[PDB]
Each structure stands twice: as C-alpha cells, then as structure tokens.
C-alpha cells in the first residue's frame, strides 16, 4: 500500500496543445492531460509489476466524471479492476478506489464522461501497491501466416487442379448444406449431379430418381443449392431464411416431383452485399452465422458476394512497407463496427484500436469463407486499390504526393495518393498499389478475378487530376496484377460521373453496380457506354425497420430491363443491412430465374403459404392489404422504410428520425390496421409458425409506429394551444403506447439489443475486458449516435441506424420522449420555459455504459401473446378508434 513514486511513465494517443499525457503524473494538481479526440484513455506504466491496493484520480475542475480502470500483468490482457459511474462531482480531495491486491505492470484509465465538456482530463493519478520484484514480459509482435504455408492453400489448389476431387467436394458440401438446412435425416433423400451449363447459362434440374429420392442437377454448387431450394418451395411448402424466419417442417414422406423440371438463368452474376452490410448487420458475426448466410445465398442463386473479411491484415502488411508500425496501423483502421466507411475511404480510427489478435483471426475467417465459396462456385469480390493512405503518409514518405480528401460527416477522410505525377516526381500510387495487390495475394491467394474499390465515394477531392485519367490508371494497375481482373464499381447518386467512367479503357473488365435500381435506377448511362452493369435492389438503409418493399417493381422492371439492354450482366441486392422485409429479398433473387414479368400478387400468395406452412382466405386477405398499403408501388424518392416517430429526437415538427430519412406514411393507416386485426383473429391457428410470429410482430409494431405519429401530432397541438390538461392526457397515452411497443418488440430474438451487444462482446475468444468494453462501445454507438458529437450532430449521423428494438426502446427512445414531455408539462403547468436539451450528451451516456457493470440486456425473448397485444393496440392505441380514445 505504498505510493509508487518512481519509475512511472504514461502514454496517450491524443491531447490538446500543452496538455500532454505526462502532465497526468507530474505530481502537480494544476497541470492536466486533456483529450483531443475519441481516444479518451491514458496508459500508465508502473516501472514493474505491483500488487495494487489503491488508485487515486484527480480531475482539473468540479465536473462529474465517469471512467473505467483496467490493469495488465502480462502486457497484453487489460482487465477491468475499478470504475466510477456515479454522479458525484469531482472535488479537491480526488477519488480514491480500493483495489483487491491485483497484480499490474500497466494501467489504462478510460474517461468516458465529462459532464462539462466533450473533452476529458486527468489532473493527477496516484497508484499505491507493493512491488513484486517482477517485470512485464515482452509482448510478441503480431505474427500472421502466409496463405501458401497453410492447409488452405493445399486444399484450394487441389480443388483447382483435380476435377474429380473438386466435384466430390462440391457434391459432399451440398449434401452437408441439406443437413444444416432441414436436418441430417434428409441428406440421403437427395442425389446430386453436376451437369453442364444450358447454352452458356447456369441451370438446375429437379426430378424423381425412381426409388423415392429427389435427383437434382446443376452446373455448380450454387445451381445445385438453387435446385434443392426449388424443390423445397414448390413441392414441400418449405421456406428457408436463417435471418428473417423459416418454415422447415418437412412432410412425413418425400413428395414426388412428377414431370422433370429444367430451369436456367440468363444472368451471369447474382450479387449480394453493400459495404454497409458488413457494419450494420455483420459486424459481430461468427462463422456459424456466415455459414448460414452462404447456405442461404447459394440456395437463392447468389454467385457474387462482396468480401472484406480480414482486409485489415492485408492493409497492415501494406502499410508496414511504408514506415507504419503495427500500432500506427491500428490507429488508422477503424473499430469492428465501422469497416464499411473505413474501406469506402470515409473515416479512420473511430471505434479502435483493434486488438492484436484480430488480424490472424480475421485472415483465418476469410480463408474459411473462400474455401466454402470455392466449393459452391461463389465469386468473392476482394479489394482494389485507388490510393487511400493515412493523412501522415507524406511525413513518413517525403517524396509521396497526396490529395487531402476533406471531411465526411465530421470525420477526417483519409488522404488519396495522386493517381499520377509529373516526370521527375516519385509515383507512390504505383509503389503502394503494387505492394497492396501483392500483400492481398499473400494473405488469401488467388481466389477471384473481381475487385471492388470506390474513390470519391460520397465526397473527396480530385485535386488537379483529370477524372477519366484517374480511372484509366486505377483499372490498368488492377489488370497489371490480374490480367482477368474485373473492377466492380458502385454507382451511387450519379457518381462516378460519365467523364470518370469514360476513362475506363477496358469496358469488359469493369462492372458497375446500379445501387438503387428499385427506387432511383441509373443504368441507362452505363448501358449507353457499353459498361457491364448489375440491377440491384437496395431497399434497406441503416438497418432502419418498418414495412416497406417494392414487389411489383421487382416482378416487372427487372425482366423489362433485361429485354431493353445488352450489357445487363446480372441482378443483386445492395442493402445497408439484412434485417427487414424478407419478401423483398426472396422475390428479387427469384427474378433471376425468369425472362418474363410475373404477377407479384400471385407470387406473394404462394410465398406466404410456404413461409407459414399453411394459409387460408383471411391470411391471404391480410397480405393483399399489405400489398395494397405498405408494399404498394410508389414513384417518389425515399431512402428506406418510413421511420418511427418513437425513434426520433423529440422536438417540434419532426418529419424523420435520421437526416436523410422520412416519416411520411404514404398509405391509409386505418386500412393497414385491418391486416393486424386479421392476424390477431388467426393468431391461435398460425402461432405454431415462427415466421408468422415474425411477420405479426413486424406489422403490429408498424401499427403502433403509425399511431404514435398521430398521437404526437395531437400532443403537439395541445402544447401550441396551451392546453396543459390535454397535453398531459395525450402525452400519457403516447408514453403508454411506447411501453406497449417495447412489449411487442420483446417477443422476437431478432429485436433484442442484448443479442447485438453480446455478439460484440463475445465475437473473439480469450479477449480481455478492455476489448469487450470497446466492442460494446462499437455496438451501442452505431445504432444511436453513430459517432461522437461532431459526427452525430454537425455530421448529421444522429440515429441514422435507429432500430425498433427491445431494450433500446425502453432505455433510450422512451427516456428521450419522457424527458421532453416532462419539460413541456412543467412549462404548461405555470413553470419556467422548457430548457434546451443537449440530446447527444444524454444519448452518449447510454452509449458508454458497459454490460458487466451497468445493466445486462437479455438474450432471451419474452412469452407475450402477440394476438393479445394486438387486441390492446387496436382497442387503446389505434388510429381507427382514436376519437373514442
């Protein structure tokens, strides 16, 4: 218990001018370290291993500070040993924390809240303990394997060079898929065969074997899985969706096929995934979830998938060759929930640093994916390189020429190397691009010909450079390292411009994803320039939820585009998240297997029967109401489902929760409520279908979101009219409506914030408390404030990824509205004017709470009766009966 007064040093990753880290341990209460960015922690080295008894912390003023304290005795694992989360003000006496004789050579103090400022500080920190005489071990540097040295390389080349081995692998893997999807007991009821393409097109066949088994042919694994899916949907009344609800009840005996079926697709590619999907949905996926997704992809005909798994190791090896240590690379790379905007060159650093063990684990996961994709015949889209470098690249490489890219939503964009330079100047685009493509091959090997990169995504700066020449040189460099390369390019709000695209000198080795074809198609300019392009349904923005789909456009515009074009080489999905409206994604991929328009109404009728395992006239009537309301074709511009007012920052005249969203309901709300009445009437009969319960919760929460918007307008009028008694009553029903909404959301495991957070905290094995807390920060921030203040507010990202989720609704959305309502009520009751609320401060307080110290959110759904909840909603919180209420 003696104060450690010699040999103590400290580091920090950021500080305001003159308030450096060493000022936290200089014995002077008048000097302080102060943070300058989102790295709000300091790391103290004790000059040896001590058994700590006390830690004492002083701040620079008398604000309320909250912080978490971590310790490490091996140099790698920092585990939580103390914290302050109460609302006590700091004072001249400091805060003393008792430590239970914990061994520690290093200490981390993370100050997550300063009630007075966005920036945090530590005036002094004193550590008390007993010297053990020991010193920390030297921590091993990051060590990763080359692909060619792993068993993955042996297996990948064996598949490549041995057709008999490759066919045995594929056919066995499709059999394993069957066991995973419907059960191992059904594996031996199928016989799978590889056949040739049908006149250059992927094709599958389904027929009777002759002895009661199902014979399925296909030119590759995807076609085989698609034929297996076709048999389930059309003969077993079965529907598979591992993310959004399934019906896997198989008949007691295998239904006979009857007449043989041969079905092909005219599309070379069926594409899946936005960069954003890797953040809003897949951030914390394990291999079990990736395997499910690839099974579902193959069954839906998907053969081209964006793949950024383990790209952090590729970039580490690359930047290591240009003066960057591993620690500097970790500061450049974002956290695990922000890779989408890191690789689209929009932001750096935030959410990190990643743990040291991240790099090898993710490279291994990526190799695991490529093995499975090779078995199925799914092409991954790896990374191209367009010149992205950190902002200090010139400091370490003096001859390099770079272009400042400015800001994106308050984040500092990375720099961009000049794609070409004058003669006499060093060309670091050529240097770094050569290293990048070579390092990518070292990590994963030759797994694809498709590479994605998107300079100037949603901003940037072309500097003095010529637009077309930029894309000419980027493509040529890509082809230099892979002669068969195809540059996969996003087409998003008119970018890249025609002048940029016309710089592509090899049109057949570029492929443009028309990102938003079902709302704002933009492929005519691509078709006119003879550029291969893909028709994509985006549908989902930020994971924001609500009933929303364009089935009629999918059933008609896709074959119409094929008939009116020559360079349409596929269809696909580009959702920012895969969590809502499974009908839309089922119908899209189904449109790959036809050249004619289909009837979206009769398609929906067949879809709901296999999704629920049964149907009747009333259930069909309810879904026709959905088709006539929430799923009805529209011709305006909109990003995602209409947002729930419950999820918006409280205020006057709200028209959306997110900056680029919308809350206008374009259908009649009371008409849509009829669908809920029908579902409730049929609840007892259909409650054995999990997909029915999924859909029931989906439309019931849409009902309460729609009615909450009306109740919000009424209490807004009551305030403007000075009617305090009416405001108290209407706002009381509004808050009660939200309480009912939280109960509805609690019935679905998909809607639990606890599952999102726990996945983040457990996505790596043998991680320390520090990494778990940081990953939880990633998970909490992304669905609320997104970034910190300058990103949420000035940057416009506040509640961009708002979710109608259990736990989050009770503790975040409800709390905001309750606070706002209480303020307005006090004013109407003859009090002082309602104060301004710093919403970000309140929101960031929830963001920084930890599951092991504050509140652990459940991972188990409730048993609430959706039919009974629907009755309450219709009787007490509905639009139809609103005047009686």
Ligand X SMILES: CC(=O)N[C@@H]1[C@@H](O)[C@H](O)[C@@H](CO)N[C@H]1CO
Tokens of 438: 């070579």
Supply the minimum distance, in Å, between the C-beta of residue 25 and Ca ion: 7
The angle that helices 358-376 and 221-235 make with each other, rounded to 10 degrees, is: 70
434 binds Ca ion (CB under 5 A): no
The only residue of 276, 314, 381, 571 in contact with ligand X, by rule CB under 6 A = 276
Tell whether 379 is in a known binding site. no
Q: Which does 23 bind (CB under 5 to 8 A by kind): ligand X, Ca ion, none?
A: Ca ion
Query: Which partner from the list Ca ion, ligand X, none does 800 bind, CB cut-off 5 to 8 Å by kind?
Result: ligand X
In this structure, how many other beta carbons lie within 10 angstroms of the beta carbon of residue 739? 12
How many residues make contact with Ca ion (CB under 5 A)?
Answer: 5
Cα–Cα distance for residue pair 81/533, rounded to 1 Å: 55
The nearest distance, CB 344 to ligand X, in angstroms, is 6
d(CA 91, CA 57): 10
Burial class (CB in 10 A: 0-12, 13-18, 19+), 440: buried
- Residue 514 CB contacts under 8 Å (≥ 6 apart), including other chains: 491, 521, 522, 523, 526, 533, 534, 535, 536
Question: Least distance (Å) from ligand X to the CB of residue 313?
Answer: 23
Please identify, among the stretches 31-39, 385-393, 570-578, 734-742, the one whose residues bind Ca ion according to the rule CB under 5 A. 31-39
The interface with ligand X within residues 541-570 (CB under 6 A) comprises: 541-542
Decide which of ligand X, Ca ion, none touches 56; Cβ closer than 5 to 8 Å per partner kind: none
- Using rule CB under 5 A, residue 28 touches Ca ion: yes
CA angle 608, 264, 584 (to 5 degrees): 30
Query: Residue 784 interacts with ligand X (CB under 6 A)?
Result: no
* Cross-strand pairs, 51: 103, 130
Answer for which of 576, 698, 810, 843 binds ligand X (CB under 6 A) is 576
Q: Is 776 annotated as a binding residue?
A: no
3: β partners:
128
Residue 796 Cβ vs ligand X, minimum distance, rounded to whole Å? 8
Q: Which does 639 bind (CB under 5 to 8 A by kind): ligand X, Ca ion, none?
A: ligand X
Token code pair at residue 382: 């790896």
Q: Based on the shown chain and the rule CB under 6 A, indicate whether residue 682 belongs to the binding site for ligand X.
A: no
**Of residues 403-442, those binding ligand X (CB under 6 A):** none
Nearest in space to 644 (alpha carbons), one of 600, 581, 703: 703
494 phi and psi angles, rounded to 5 deg: 75, 0
CB closer to ligand X out of 429 and 541 = 541
- Residue 339 in the binding site for ligand X (CB under 6 A): no
Least Å distance, CB 660 to ligand X, is 5
Q: Given the complex with ligand X, which of 402 and 658 has the nearer CB atom?
A: 658
Contact 797, 409 (CB under 8 A): yes
Residues 374-393 that bind ligand X (CB under 6 A): none
Per CB under 5 A, the segment of 30-38, 463-471, 586-594, 728-736 that binds Ca ion is 30-38
Q: Parallel, antiparallel, or unpaired for β 486-491 and 388-389?
A: unpaired
Interatomic CA distance for residues 612 and 595, integer angstroms:
28
What is the closest distance, in whole angstroms, from the C-beta atom of residue 447 to ligand X in the complex?
25
DSSP 334-353: --TT-HHHHHTTS--STT-P
697 binds ligand X (CB under 6 A): no
Nearest to 236 by CA among 244, 245, 246: 246
Note the helical H segments in 564-616: 582-590, 600-612
Choices 119-127, 230-238, 290-298, 811-819 (CB under 5 A): range interacting with Ca ion:
119-127
Instruction: Measure the CA angle with vertex 714, ends 711 and 717; round to 5°.
Output: 155
Edge-to-edge order in the sheet of strand 214-218: 190-194, 214-218, 203-208, 261-264
Task: Among 20, 22, 26, 209, indicate the residue that binds Ca ion (CB under 5 A).
Answer: 26
Angle between helices 690-720 and 669-681 (to 10 degrees): 140
Q: Phi/psi at 35 (nearest 5 deg)?
A: -70, 150
Total of residues contacting ligand X (CB under 6 A):
11
Parallel/antiparallel/unpaired status of strands 510-514 and 486-491: parallel
- Is 275 or 712 the residue whose CB approaches ligand X more closely? 275
Nearest to ligand X of 33, 786 (CB atom):
786
Under the phi-then-psi rule, with left for phi > 0, alpha for psi from -120 to 50, and beta for the rest, what region is 199? left
Q: How far is the CB of 536 from ligand X (least distance, A)?
A: 10
Q: Does 274 bind ligand X (CB under 6 A)?
A: yes
Whether 341 has a binding-site annotation, put simply, is yes
Q: Is residue 274 a known part of a binding site?
A: yes
Stretch of residues binding Ca ion (CB under 5 A), selected from 21-29, 155-163, 374-382, 645-653: 21-29
Does 22 participate in binding Ca ion (rule CB under 5 A)? no
Q: Tell me which of 146, 426, 660, 735 binds ligand X, using CB under 6 A.
A: 660
Residue 280 known to bind ligand: yes
When CB distances are held under 5 to 8 angstroms depending on the partner's kind, the choice from Ca ion, ligand X, none that residue 31 binds is Ca ion
- Looking at the Cβ atoms of 515 and 764, the one nearer to ligand X is 515
Q: Does 492 bind ligand X (CB under 6 A)?
A: yes
**Was 254 annotated as part of a binding site?**
no
- Please name the residue that has the structure tokens 């009912």: 740
Residue length of the chain: 885
Which H or E run includes 475? Answer: helix 467-481
Residue 721, C-beta contacts closer than 8 angstroms, at least 6 positions apart: none
Told to check if 193 binds Ca ion by CB under 5 A, we report no
Angstrom CA distances, 79 to 3, 68, 378, 777, 810, stand at 22, 10, 41, 16, 30
* Contact by Cβ (8 Å): 313, 443: yes
Query: Which window, 18-26, 377-385, 478-486, 568-576, contacts Ca ion (CB under 5 A)?
Result: 18-26
Q: Return phi, psi of residue 780, to 5°.
A: -70, -40
Please, what is the minimum distance in Å from the beta carbon of residue 408 to ligand X?
9
Q: In the bound complex, what is the minimum distance in angstroms from residue 659's beta carbon to ligand X?
A: 9
609 is in an annotated binding site: no
User: Please, what is the minimum distance in Å from the beta carbon of residue 405 to ligand X?
Assistant: 15
Nearest-approach distance from CB 71 to Ca ion, in angstroms: 21
Minimal CA–CA distance to 596: which of 541, 559, 632, 634? Answer: 559
Angle, helices 690-720 vs 724-745, to 10°: value is 170
At closest approach, how far in Å is the CB of 269 from ligand X?
Answer: 19
| Residue 287 touches which of Ca ion, ligand X, none (Cβ within 5-8 Å per kind) | none
Secondary structure (3-state) at 235: helix
State the binding partner of 28 from ligand X, Ca ion, none, CB within 5 to 8 A by kind: Ca ion
Alpha carbons 248 and 180: distance in angstroms, whole number: 11
Q: Measured between alpha carbons, how far is 345 from 389 in angstroms, rounded to an integer?
A: 9
From candidates 800, 812, 857, 877, binder to ligand X by CB under 6 A: 800
Asked whether position 31 contacts Ca ion by CB under 5 A, the answer is yes
What is the smallest separation between the CB atom of 96 and Ca ion, expressed in angstroms?
17
The entry of ligand X, Ca ion, none near residue 26 (CB within 5 to 8 angstroms by kind) is: Ca ion
Map residue 783 onto helix, strand or coil: coil
Least distance to ligand X, CB of residue 786, Å: 7
Q: Which residues contact 21 (CB under 8 A, 6 or more apart)?
A: 10, 11, 12, 15, 33, 42
Residue with tokens 């011709």: 635
Q: Please give the backbone phi and psi of residue 833, each rounded to the nearest 5 degrees, phi first.
A: -55, 145
Is residue 326 within the footprint of Ca ion (CB under 5 A)? no
Question: Closest CB to Ca ion among 28 and 286?
Answer: 28
Quick check: 126 binds Ca ion (CB under 5 A)?
Answer: no
Residues that bind Ca ion (CB under 5 A): 23, 26, 28, 31, 124
Known binding-site residue numbers for Ca(2+) = 23, 26, 28, 31, 123-124
Known binding-site residue numbers = 23, 26, 28, 31, 123-124, 274, 280, 341, 344, 576
Known binding-site residue numbers for N-acetyl-D-glucosamine = 274, 280, 341, 344, 576
Residues that bind ligand X (CB under 6 A): 274, 276, 492, 515, 541-542, 576, 639, 660, 797, 800
């Amino acid at each position: 218990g003696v104060e450690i007064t010699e040999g103590v040093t400290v580091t920090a990753k950021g500080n305001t001018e003159g308030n450096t880290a060493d000022l936290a341990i200089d014995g002077d209460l008048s000097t302080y370290w102060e943070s300058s960015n989102d790295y709000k922690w300091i790391e103290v080295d004790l000059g040896g291993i001590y058994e700590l008894s006390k830690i004492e912390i002083f701040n620079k003023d008398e604000a309320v500070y909250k912080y978490n304290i971590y310790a490490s005795e091996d140099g790698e694992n920092f585990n939580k040993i103390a914290y302050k989360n109460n609302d006590n003000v700091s004072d001249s006496n400091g805060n003393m924390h008792t430590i239970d004789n914990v061994r520690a050579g290093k200490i981390r103090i993370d100050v997550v809240q300063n009630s007075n400022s966005d920036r945090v500080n530590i005036a002094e920190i004193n550590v008390f303990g007993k010297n053990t005489g020991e010193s920390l071990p030297e921590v091993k540097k990051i060590a990763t394997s080359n692909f060619s040295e792993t068993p993955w390389a042996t297996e990948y080349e064996k598949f490549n060079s041995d057709s008999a081995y490759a066919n045995e692998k594929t056919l066995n893997e499709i059999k394993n898929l069957v066991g995973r999807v419907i059960g191992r007991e059904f594996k031996d009821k199928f016989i799978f065969e590889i056949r040739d393409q049908l006149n250059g097109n992927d094709v599958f066949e389904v027929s009777d074997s002759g002895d009661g088994k199902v014979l399925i042919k296909g030119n590759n694994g995807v076609s085989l899985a698609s034929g297996f899916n076709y048999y389930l949907k059309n003969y077993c009344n079965v529907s598979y969706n591992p993310i959004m609800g399934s019906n896997l009840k198989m008949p007691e005996t295998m239904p006979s096929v009857g007449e043989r079926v041969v079905i092909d697709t005219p599309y070379e590619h069926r594409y899946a995934l936005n960069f954003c999907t890797y953040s809003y949905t897949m951030s914390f996926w394990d291999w079990d979830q990736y395997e499910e997704f690839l099974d579902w992809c193959a069954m839906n005909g998907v053969n081209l998938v964006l793949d950024i798994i383990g790209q952090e190791e590729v970039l580490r090896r690359t930047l290591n060759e240009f003066g960057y240590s591993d620690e500097e690379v970790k500061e450049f790379i974002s956290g695990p929930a922000y890779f989408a905007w890191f690789y689209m060159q929009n932001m750096t650093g935030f959410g990190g640093p990643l743990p040291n063990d991240w790099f090898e684990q993710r490279a291994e996961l990526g190799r695991k994916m490529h093995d499975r994709m090779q078995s199925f015949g799914i092409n991954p889209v790896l990374q191209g390189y367009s010149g992205m470098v950190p902002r200090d690249f010139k400091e370490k490489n003096q001859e390099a020429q770079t272009i400042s890219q400015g800001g994106w939503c308050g984040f500092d964009r990375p720099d961009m190397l000049k794609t070409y330079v004058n003669e006499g100047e060093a060309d670091y685009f050529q240097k770094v691009a050569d290293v990048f493509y070579e390092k990518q091959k070292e990590v994963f090997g030759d797994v694809t010909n498709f590479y994605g990169v998107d300079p100037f995504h949603e901003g940037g700066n072309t500097g003095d450079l010529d637009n077309g020449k930029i894309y000419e040189i980027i493509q040529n460099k890509m082809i230099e390292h892979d002669n068969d390369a195809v540059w996969v390019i996003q087409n998003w709000q008119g970018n890249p411009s025609n002048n940029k695209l016309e710089g592509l000198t090899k049109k057949d080795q570029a492929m443009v994803l028309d990102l938003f074809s079902e709302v704002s198609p933009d492929w005519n300019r691509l078709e006119e320039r003879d550029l291969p392009w893909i028709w994509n349904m985006l549908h989902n923005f930020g994971g924001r939820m609500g009933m929303d789909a364009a089935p009629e456009k999918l059933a008609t515009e896709i074959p119409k585009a094929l008939a009116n074009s020559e360079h349409m080489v596929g269809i696909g999905i580009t959702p920012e998240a895969i969590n809502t409206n499974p009908l839309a994604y089922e119908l899209l991929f189904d449109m790959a297997w036809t050249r004619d328009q289909i009837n979206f109404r009769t398609w929906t009728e067949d879809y709901i029967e296999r999704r629920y395992g049964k149907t009747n006239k009333e259930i069909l009537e309810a879904w026709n109401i959905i088709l006539d309301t929430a799923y009805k074709k529209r011709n305006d511009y909109y990003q995602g489902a209409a947002e729930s007012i419950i999820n918006a920052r409280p205020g006057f005249g709200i028209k959306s929760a997110s900056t680029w969203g919308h809350s206008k309901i374009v259908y009649d709300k009371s008409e849509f409520e009829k669908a809920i009445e029908i579902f409730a009437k049929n609840y007892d009969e259909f409650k054995d279908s999990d997909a029915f319960l999924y859909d029931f919760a989906d439309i019931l929460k849409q009902l309460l979101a729609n009615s909450a918007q009306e109740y919000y307008e009424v209490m807004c009028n009551a305030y403007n009219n000075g009617n305090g008694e009416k405001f108290k009553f209407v706002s009381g029903k509004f808050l009660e409506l939200i309480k009912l909404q939280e109960r509805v959301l609690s019935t679905r495991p998909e809607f639990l914030i606890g599952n999102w957070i726990e996945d983040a905290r457990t996505m790596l094995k043998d991680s320390d408390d520090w990494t778990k807390d940081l990953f939880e920060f990633n998970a909490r921030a992304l669905v609320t404030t997104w970034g910190s203040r300058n990103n949420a507010d000035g940057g416009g990202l506040k509640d961009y990824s708002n979710r109608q989720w259990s736990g989050l609704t009770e503790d975040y959305y409800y709390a905001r509205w309750e606070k706002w309502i209480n303020g307005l009520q006090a004013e109407l009751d003859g009090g002082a004017k309602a104060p301004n609320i710093d919403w970000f401060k309140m929101e960031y307080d929830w963001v920084n709470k930890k599951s092991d110290t504050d509140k652990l959110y459940p991972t188990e759904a409730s048993n609430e009766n959706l039919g009974e909840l629907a009755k309450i909603a219709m009787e007490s919180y509905s639009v139809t009966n609103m005047d009686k209420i």
